[PDB]
Scaffold this active site. Structure first.
Site, mmCIF file in Angstrom:
data_model
loop_
_atom_site.group_PDB
_atom_site.id
_atom_site.type_symbol
_atom_site.label_atom_id
_atom_site.label_comp_id
_atom_site.label_asym_id
_atom_site.label_seq_id
_atom_site.Cartn_x
_atom_site.Cartn_y
_atom_site.Cartn_z
ATOM 1 C CB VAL A 29 -1.098 0.042 1.402
ATOM 2 C CG1 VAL A 29 -1.841 1.443 1.351
ATOM 3 C CG2 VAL A 29 -1.969 -1.080 1.214
ATOM 4 C CB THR B 21 -7.927 -2.106 7.134
ATOM 5 O OG1 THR B 21 -6.769 -2.945 7.472
ATOM 6 C CG2 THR B 21 -8.050 -2.525 5.569
ATOM 7 C CD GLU C 120 -4.942 1.590 -1.884
ATOM 8 O OE1 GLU C 120 -4.039 2.523 -1.644
ATOM 9 O OE2 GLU C 120 -5.062 1.105 -3.108
ATOM 10 C CD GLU D 198 -0.822 -8.756 -0.517
ATOM 11 O OE1 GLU D 198 -1.270 -8.293 0.552
ATOM 12 O OE2 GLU D 198 -0.053 -9.698 -0.847
ATOM 13 C CE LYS E 74 -10.480 -1.591 2.191
ATOM 14 N NZ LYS E 74 -8.849 -1.429 2.038
ATOM 15 C CG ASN F 89 -14.251 -5.921 0.544
ATOM 16 O OD1 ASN F 89 -14.063 -5.814 -0.597
ATOM 17 N ND2 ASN F 89 -13.043 -5.926 1.397
ATOM 18 C CE1 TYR G 94 -15.245 -10.350 -8.606
ATOM 19 C CE2 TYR G 94 -15.606 -11.365 -6.283
ATOM 20 C CZ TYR G 94 -14.762 -10.366 -7.231
ATOM 21 O OH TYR G 94 -13.505 -9.974 -6.986
ATOM 22 C CG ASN G 95 -21.121 -15.428 -12.753
ATOM 23 O OD1 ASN G 95 -19.846 -15.565 -12.746
ATOM 24 N ND2 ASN G 95 -22.086 -15.322 -13.871
ATOM 25 N N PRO H 177 -19.538 -20.727 -9.070
ATOM 26 C CG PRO H 177 -21.552 -22.054 -9.279
ATOM 27 C CD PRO H 177 -20.356 -21.418 -10.310
ATOM 28 C CB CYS I 238 -10.534 -9.024 2.021
ATOM 29 S SG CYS I 238 -9.057 -8.144 1.560
ATOM 30 C CG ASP J 250 -13.171 -7.003 5.299
ATOM 31 O OD1 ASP J 250 -12.250 -6.948 6.095
ATOM 32 O OD2 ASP J 250 -12.906 -6.341 4.217
HETATM 33 N N1 LIG Z 1 -2.118 -5.811 0.861
HETATM 34 C C1 LIG Z 1 -3.430 -5.383 0.553
HETATM 35 O O1 LIG Z 1 -4.083 -6.111 -0.140
HETATM 36 C C2 LIG Z 1 -4.213 -4.273 1.163
HETATM 37 C C3 LIG Z 1 -4.021 -3.998 2.470
HETATM 38 N N2 LIG Z 1 -4.387 -2.713 3.089
HETATM 39 C C4 LIG Z 1 -4.335 -2.288 4.334
HETATM 40 O O2 LIG Z 1 -2.788 -1.516 4.173
HETATM 41 C C5 LIG Z 1 -2.027 -1.517 5.469
HETATM 42 C C6 LIG Z 1 -0.452 -2.117 5.144
HETATM 43 O O3 LIG Z 1 -0.949 -3.154 4.233
HETATM 44 P P1 LIG Z 1 0.539 -3.720 3.458
HETATM 45 O O4 LIG Z 1 0.880 -2.560 2.623
HETATM 46 O O5 LIG Z 1 -0.003 -5.076 2.810
HETATM 47 O O6 LIG Z 1 1.533 -3.969 4.712
HETATM 48 P P2 LIG Z 1 2.956 -4.434 4.495
HETATM 49 O O7 LIG Z 1 3.008 -5.527 5.611
HETATM 50 O O8 LIG Z 1 2.966 -5.220 2.999
HETATM 51 O O9 LIG Z 1 3.874 -3.337 4.708
HETATM 52 C C7 LIG Z 1 4.030 -2.949 6.088
HETATM 53 C C8 LIG Z 1 5.098 -1.977 6.040
HETATM 54 O O10 LIG Z 1 5.151 -1.178 7.396
HETATM 55 C C9 LIG Z 1 6.282 -1.453 7.882
HETATM 56 N N3 LIG Z 1 5.960 -0.967 9.411
HETATM 57 C C10 LIG Z 1 5.585 -1.577 10.368
HETATM 58 N N4 LIG Z 1 5.215 -0.744 11.366
HETATM 59 C C11 LIG Z 1 5.852 0.376 10.978
HETATM 60 C C12 LIG Z 1 5.918 1.705 11.558
HETATM 61 N N5 LIG Z 1 5.560 1.891 13.101
HETATM 62 N N6 LIG Z 1 6.233 2.971 10.969
HETATM 63 C C13 LIG Z 1 6.779 2.793 9.721
HETATM 64 N N7 LIG Z 1 6.696 1.495 9.178
HETATM 65 C C14 LIG Z 1 6.106 0.293 9.704
HETATM 66 C C15 LIG Z 1 6.666 -2.841 7.848
HETATM 67 O O11 LIG Z 1 7.986 -3.062 8.046
HETATM 68 C C16 LIG Z 1 6.338 -2.808 6.263
HETATM 69 O O12 LIG Z 1 7.374 -2.716 5.507
HETATM 70 C C17 LIG Z 1 -2.832 -2.566 6.374
HETATM 71 O O13 LIG Z 1 -3.931 -1.775 7.168
HETATM 72 C C18 LIG Z 1 -3.741 -3.295 5.406
HETATM 73 O O14 LIG Z 1 -4.807 -3.947 5.845
HETATM 74 C C19 LIG Z 1 -5.581 -1.895 2.108
HETATM 75 C C20 LIG Z 1 -6.068 -2.338 1.128
HETATM 76 C C21 LIG Z 1 -5.433 -3.601 0.368
HETATM 77 O O1 LIG Z 2 -17.193 -15.860 -8.971
HETATM 78 C C1 LIG Z 2 -16.580 -16.010 -7.984
HETATM 79 C C2 LIG Z 2 -15.656 -14.887 -7.560
HETATM 80 C C3 LIG Z 2 -15.110 -14.848 -6.439
HETATM 81 N N1 LIG Z 2 -14.964 -16.074 -5.425
HETATM 82 C C4 LIG Z 2 -14.454 -16.085 -4.254
HETATM 83 O O2 LIG Z 2 -14.494 -14.983 -3.507
HETATM 84 C C5 LIG Z 2 -13.472 -14.800 -2.731
HETATM 85 C C6 LIG Z 2 -12.610 -13.481 -3.486
HETATM 86 O O3 LIG Z 2 -12.321 -13.599 -4.607
HETATM 87 P P1 LIG Z 2 -11.711 -12.506 -5.430
HETATM 88 O O4 LIG Z 2 -12.364 -11.081 -5.499
HETATM 89 O O5 LIG Z 2 -10.217 -12.125 -4.209
HETATM 90 O O6 LIG Z 2 -10.889 -13.004 -6.807
HETATM 91 C C7 LIG Z 2 -12.399 -15.867 -3.279
HETATM 92 O O7 LIG Z 2 -12.463 -16.975 -2.375
HETATM 93 C C8 LIG Z 2 -13.071 -16.321 -4.458
HETATM 94 O O8 LIG Z 2 -12.380 -17.674 -4.917
HETATM 95 C C9 LIG Z 2 -16.090 -17.442 -6.003
HETATM 96 O O9 LIG Z 2 -16.105 -18.136 -5.135
HETATM 97 N N2 LIG Z 2 -16.748 -17.071 -7.194
#
Ligand SMILES: NC(=O)C1=CN([C@@H]2O[C@H](COP(=O)(O)OP(=O)(O)OC[C@H]3O[C@@H](n4cnc5c(N)ncnc54)[C@H](O)[C@@H]3O)[C@@H](O)[C@H]2O)C=CC1
Ligand SMILES: O=c1ccn([C@@H]2O[C@H](COP(=O)(O)O)[C@@H](O)[C@H]2O)c(=O)[nH]1
Ligand SMILES: NC(=O)C1=CN([C@@H]2O[C@H](COP(=O)(O)OP(=O)(O)OC[C@H]3O[C@@H](n4cnc5c(N)ncnc54)[C@H](O)[C@@H]3O)[C@@H](O)[C@H]2O)C=CC1
Ligand SMILES: O=c1ccn([C@@H]2O[C@H](COP(=O)(O)O)[C@@H](O)[C@H]2O)c(=O)[nH]1
Lengths: 377, 377
Positions: free
Chosen positions: A13, A120, A143, A147, A199, A203, A244-245, A247, A255, A259
């Protein structure tokens, strides 16, 4: 304008937002891990994201990293907080300690910086923390990235939502639009708590949609009907759509399971049936799938790839039927007390029924004993 | 090809399909009401539909009507059955007597005609009736039109679904495509029972979607949040969309309340949580809305326009609070034991709170005491 934006946390992020903004402004990325900072200063990404590594290495970004909080925060116009947080559904505990530590640090070092939280956080977090510390400079902005496409999703975002209605919130939205490739991005300004709930509701709707098509699939299996025929007919209604349909053994991933539960906990004093049903429906669907498998009287069930499939595994083992697992990525020889078989051919021979959330080319020659509800993969 | 297609039942469905097909083939419309037939033969429509009346009166259609079954069915290549049917959720009884009478008549008069059922029938109806009578010439094809746009929806259909996979089913789909204005219409051929379940699953998903956004709205009201901010933020996700997301007093209308219950009855032996929750959620939402209104301690509640609003009315009256109704279309002076006030101004003065499913221009001057959850109307 040419501003200074500090990123706190250089993960998916933080780096997605930081690299995006470094194309037009001064970005300083702060992490607590010195080695990640050193890598970044050599233009090496500490995470796996094609676009981030490509941009870091090949585009002229006004970007640098540091572990020095003072160097990072001084003179920053905005600080984007992107540190780790975690919600535990069993206890309804949302660990926001890293976000609160950053708010503490910024408030002390640069009380004029405007913090934008991308991490989050629980619904109501921002309004409450401002009130608690008696500060005004914190705004939440959800956000929406995934990933693996972290930078890509902010170069082409669905929308930008900033949880404050103000000129400073709008200037932050402009930074996100300026770095993006996609043009005329939908932009929405809301109050704080509302933004924080987006979100969860989005979600949970996705989990609801998956749970619904899965109940349609339970019915189709139960009734000896062709699920694809029904789903395609239904989804040709433009108000429903063909996405998203597909099975599955239940909604899973990182997430949705959490969530949906987090949102249900937030509904503790709000009458509802659908929010609670979304959580219960997944357990029911897994019971249905497990029961279907068990009705085949297998002596050994093979699990092809390891996440809702874990719930199916648990249920099969609860009935005393052995499970073997094919998962190349796993190096252990056991997962939750079940054998991990490294050889695909041995796995295929031994398993009486092979379950897989989605069909796979390499299961083609044993298709006759594969049980999957996948239709569109 | 230039075929003869008979329509049995000259209502919205029969006439939409008949006028559409009469543009290119010979259509003979059969009704049991002689006066409707006489009107049709004078090119006067017995129903309210702009396009049907326009087409009947102004386009060269090979169309005529009769009450004579023999004249209607002889030499017909297809007979489209569009007679009335009704499902009663209280008893789980689906009255298909008119459809069965037509199948009886066609089988006797012209056993070579292929019947296409457009009327709503219970899931499994066609497979069973073919088996019962020992005939093969019956196919179900769902009708997706809306009253008021009956012909328009078949000139521009979302999709065409025919519940048989055969050349004769395809030739029928071609008739629907040939008369349509919309081109490259999505066409789907399924087996019988699958086709019969499509509308139930599609309409129940729509009710689920409305029930979900209504629970989001219950939460927003309960928590003092701006529902529009949250909904717009959520719906900007392209997997969710900005349609069917307007809060209301509950899903209503002619189809959704009954279809959701019909589908739930079909799930009597299939484990589920979402299908049952869709029905329960509407009752919960109406209780929440009624309780919100009652919390204002009104001495008189005004109901502006009369259908989920009826459930709110019932609940308010159950607590002993009088309700007055403003409904110009109604001529009676009482509806379910409540006064119908003809004068809008008197209605406005007397009502302490005016509830309305959707906002209306004429309630603008009393907006301060109007309670509506409408956001996007
Ligand atoms: N990865 C995802 O798919 C998504 C994540 N988020 C949210 O964004 C936030 C971060 O997620 P990621 O980027 O995936 O985390 P990440 O774990 O990939 O990177 C987090 C970074 O923060 C650093 N860190 C830890 N404590 C710190 C501090 N006090 N000061 C400065 N840096 C510090 C860590 O060393 C690390 O490099 C979480 O709340 C997550 O739930 C939101 C949307 C999507
Ligand atoms: O048609 C779909 C789309 C998504 N998912 C499930 O919903 C969760 C979120 O999917 P995604 O949004 O991360 O791709 C995952 O466990 C994915 O397998 C299904 O079962 N069927
Ligand atoms: N109106 C709608 O929105 C939709 C209705 N449907 C279904 O289509 C069927 C017909 O609906 P409508 O067109 O609205 O009905 P309608 O009531 O508007 O017209 C039905 C016609 O059938 C005639 N009729 C009754 N018994 C007959 C018989 N034995 N033989 C010949 N004619 C007979 C009636 O006199 C009447 O003119 C029903 O099953 C309905 O549920 C399906 C999709 C949409
Ligand atoms: O955004 C929406 C869309 C539809 N409905 C309700 O769902 C039912 C079916 O609507 P329609 O598809 O007939 O327009 C009606 O009671 C309608 O008011 C809503 O409450 N909100």
């Amino acid at each position: 304008e040419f501003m200074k934006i500090t990123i706190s946390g250089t993960g998916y992020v933080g780096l997605s937002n930081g690299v995006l903004i470094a194309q037009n402004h001064e970005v300083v990325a702060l992490d607590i891990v010195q080695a990640k900072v050193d890598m970044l200063n050599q233009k090496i990404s500490p995470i796996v994201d094609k676009e981030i590594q490509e941009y870091l290495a090949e585009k002229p970004l006004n970007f640098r990293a540091t572990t020095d909080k003072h160097d990072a925060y001084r003179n920053a116009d905005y600080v984007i907080i992107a540190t780790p947080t975690d919600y535990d559904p069993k206890t309804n505990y949302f660990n926001t300690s890293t976000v609160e530590a950053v708010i503490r640090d910024v408030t002390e070092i640069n009380p004029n910086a405007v913090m934008i939280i991308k991490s989050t956080i629980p619904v109501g977090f921002t309004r409450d923390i401002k009130e608690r510390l008696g500060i005004d400079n914190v705004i939440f902005s959800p956000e929406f990235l995934r990933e693996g496409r972290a930078l890509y999703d902010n170069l082409h975002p669905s929308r930008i939502v900033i949880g404050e209605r103000s000129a400073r919130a709008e200037r932050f939205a402009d930074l996100l639009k300026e770095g993006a490739i996609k043009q005329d991005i939908p932009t929405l300004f809301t109050d704080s708590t509302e933004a924080e709930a987006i979100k969860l509701f989005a979600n949970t709707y996705l989990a609801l949609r998956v749970a619904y098509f899965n109940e349609l699939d339970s019915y189709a299996e139960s009734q000896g009907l062709n699920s694809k025929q029904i789903i395609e007919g239904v989804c040709l209604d433009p108000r429903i759509g063909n996405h998203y349909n597909n099975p599955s053994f239940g909604y899973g991933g990182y997430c949705l399971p959490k969530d949906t539960k987090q949102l249900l906990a937030n509904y503790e004093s709000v009458p509802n049936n659908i929010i609670a049903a979304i959580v219960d429906a997944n357990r029911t669907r897994k019971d249905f799938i497990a029961d279907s498998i068990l009705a085949r009287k297998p002596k050994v069930v093979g699990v092809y790839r390891l996440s809702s499939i874990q719930g199916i595994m648990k249920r099969i083992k609860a009935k005393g039927i052995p499970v073997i697992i094919y998962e190349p990525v796993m190096q252990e020889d056991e997962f939750f007390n079940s054998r991990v078989v490294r050889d695909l051919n041995a796995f295929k021979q031994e398993a009486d029924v092979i379950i897989s959330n989605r069909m796979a080319e390499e299961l083609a020659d044993v298709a006759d004993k594969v049980y999957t509800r996948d239709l569109f993969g």
